[PDB]
Ligand binder design. Structure first.
Ligand SMILES: O=C(O)CNC(=O)C(=O)O
Ligand SMILES: [Mg+2]
Ligand code: NI
Ligand SMILES: [Zn+2]
Length: 331
């Protein structure tokens, strides 16, 4: 078996290798990349997502989210308080203010220590889930707006045509902005490009050990767990690396910088935080290997997780038994 310790692998494709997305994903998995739940992809030195980022300030963040924490330093939930719309220009100015800016620090390690020590005493503001793309339409390789769709993958694999479309989202982050422990909708893959600014640190549990994370989570968030059999889909729960180590949960960590891609793999639980002002673009995708994970994916039926129009059809085809009760959580 390739990558038996489930380490995060880093790839350096040539411009020749960078022409065929599907085939490069298949290559990475032949080297065991998926076992980690997360891989880093450094694009060829010749490749650019777009010419410059000089004209992005007028993008609107219609619903900025203030991330308010409750709990203890290493075990907390966050809720999202809706704030008034601002442009990316205004947001960037906010992220750089004395109140929200990244603090003085030695290295990613000193910064990580400060994040986990101090996160809960602050409420950073995230621009999340904004429909759009910053890839130049002339960028032909690894353009997240031009990937093959999940609906076409399902159709090629299973012979059934379904409704739905699949488009990218932009995330604008600042210091301490946080992504809670989760897998993707329907345990899909994701791909994430950090377009500009400060880094993003990621924690990930190998897919083969995901259930151990879930079991710890049921113990750490006992009331959430009683309310919903898949409460991690609410994307509110945080657990520090110290707490994970204390409980024997296998995981890994890696820091993404501007200009790099990350791929998350089916059923790879991940979480993280932003080091300062940045902009990332992400989208879900599928391969033939995803189909079985889609069929087994846990669902939120308490009605908190509330998920896309396109997800309906996945549940309808892949999980016809769940499909009655699930859309009751959606309606
Ligand atoms: O970048 C973020 O804040 C969240 N993105 C993801 O969880 C992802 O790409 O899978
Ligand atoms: Mg603009
Ligand atoms: Ni994700
Ligand atoms: Zn739920």
């Amino acid at each position: 078996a390739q990558n038996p310790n489930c380490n995060i692998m880093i790839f350096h494709p040539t411009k020749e290798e960078f022409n065929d997305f599907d085939k490069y994903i298949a290559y990475m998995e032949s080297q065991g990349a998926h076992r980690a739940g997360l891989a880093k992809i450094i694009p060829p030195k010749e490749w650019k997502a777009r010419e410059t980022y000089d004209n992005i300030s007028e993008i609107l963040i219609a619903t900025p989210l203030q991330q308010v924490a409750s709990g203890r330093a290493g075990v907390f939930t966050q809720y999202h308080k809706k704030k008034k719309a601002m442009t990316v220009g205004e947001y960037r100015h906010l992220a750089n203010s004395k109140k929200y800016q990244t603090p003085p620090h030695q290295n990613f390690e000193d910064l990580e220590r400060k994040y986990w020590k101090n996160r809960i005493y602050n409420s950073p503001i995230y621009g999340a889930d904004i429909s759009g793309s910053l890839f130049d339409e002339n960028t032909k390789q690894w353009n997240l707006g031009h990937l093959g769709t999940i609906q076409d993958l399902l159709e090629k694999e299973c012979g059934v045509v379904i409704e739905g479309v699949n488009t990218p989202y932009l995330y604008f982050g600042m210091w301490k902005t946080t992504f809670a422990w989760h897998t993707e909708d329907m345990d899909l893959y994701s791909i994430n490009y950090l377009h500009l600014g400060e880094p993003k640190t990621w924690y990930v549990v190998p897919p083969e050990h995901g259930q151990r994370l879930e079991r710890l989570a049921r113990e750490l968030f006992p009331g959430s767990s009683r309310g919903c059999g898949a409460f991690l889909r609410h994307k509110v729960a945080l657990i520090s690396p110290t707490v994970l180590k204390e409980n024997g949960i296998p995981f890994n960590r890696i820091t993404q910088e501007a200009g790099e891609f990350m791929v998350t793999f089916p059923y790879g639980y991940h979480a993280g935080f932003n080091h300062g002002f940045n902009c990332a673009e992400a989208i879900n995708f599928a391969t033939p290997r995803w189909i079985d994970y889609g069929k087994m994916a846990s669902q939120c039926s308490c009605g908190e997780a509330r998920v896309t129009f396109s997800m309906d059809a996945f549940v309808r085809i892949l999980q016809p038994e769940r499909y009655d009760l699930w859309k009751r959580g959606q309606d």
